[PDB]
């Protein structure tokens, strides 16, 4: 019936990264993402009017608190018009990279838009794990949260420690490494495995591209061809979509 100013405090919270790592949680806002993100993560509280609590299965072992219709959202939420439903989730146990089929590599894209549209890219052709490295976007801020579409119920996002060295590793296991470059293979011409082969494909921001340290471990170079009516980049968003579109096309 009421929120104590811990858990108030606590909430208010997780819209900072410090927080998110001291309590190893992260909040979701709104009936649609927090029902379809509630069967894959671990909920540790759900808060929300009788409305928004019926209409979803009942966490096993989480803090329930049913608030009044007058409750103010505001007072807790990350967003410009809340909806009346937050949930928390743990964070999941920060994971070994995995490759399982085609699998992304985000190195330095830095902005939260471009990290949520590649998410929802990734969840529609059914990219299963994307790996994110230095410099790039914090999945579970509520920023890119909000503007997942759903994706995290199925996309895996692994924060990397040492993407290098994770290359590095992989590359010399067989599995090839693929890189977007303004000078490369058409991706057209390029022959690629099945979407369900291993295969990391490496995208950098359009700002500044895959760093040379990076671009060293890379396998196969792809272009995505120009054709304009005249003789710099696209969106890594863009560019990454076209990519999906065309492994999958082949598959």
């Keep these: 019936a ?54 979803v299965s009942t966490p096993h072992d989480a803090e329930v608190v049913e ?55 990734a969840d529609w052709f059914g990219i299963r794990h994307v790996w994110l490295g230095t410099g790039s976007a914090d999945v579970f801020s509520p920023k890119v949260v909000q503007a997942s579409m759903g994706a995290l119920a199925r996309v895996q996002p692994t924060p990397l420690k040492n993407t ?11 599995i090839p490494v693929y890189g ?9 011409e390029a022959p ?3 979407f369900t082969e291993p295969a990391i494909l490496v995208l950098g921001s359009e700002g500044r591209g895959i760093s040379p340290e990076v671009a060293a471990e890379i396998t196969d170079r792809l272009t995505i061809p120009a054709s304009g009516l005249s003789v710099e980049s696209l969106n890594v968003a863009i560019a990454t979509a076209i990519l999906c579109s065309e492994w999958r096309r082949r598959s």
């Design 2 to 55: 009421m929120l104590s100013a811990n858990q108030i405090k606590f909430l208010r919270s997780l819209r900072e990264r410090k927080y998110r790592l001291r309590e190893q949680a992260f909040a979701v806002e709104g009936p649609k993402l927090v029902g379809e993100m509630l069967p894959f993560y671990r909920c540790r509280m759900l808060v929300g009017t009788a409305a928004m609590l019926r209409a």
């Design 192 to 194: 690629l495995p099945n």
């Design 180 to 188: 977007a470059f303004l000078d490369g293979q058409s991706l057209y």
């Design 67 to 121: 608030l009044p219709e007058s409750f103010d959202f505001k007072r807790i939420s990350t967003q410009t018009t809340p909806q009346p439903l937050m949930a928390v989730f743990d964070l999941p146990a920060e994971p070994e990279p995995v490759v399982e089929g085609l699998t992304l590599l985000l190195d330095g894209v830095q902005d939260p838009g471009n990290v949520g549209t590649i998410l929802r890219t």
């Design 164 to 174: 290098v060295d994770t290359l590095a590793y992989f590359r010399r296991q067989g």
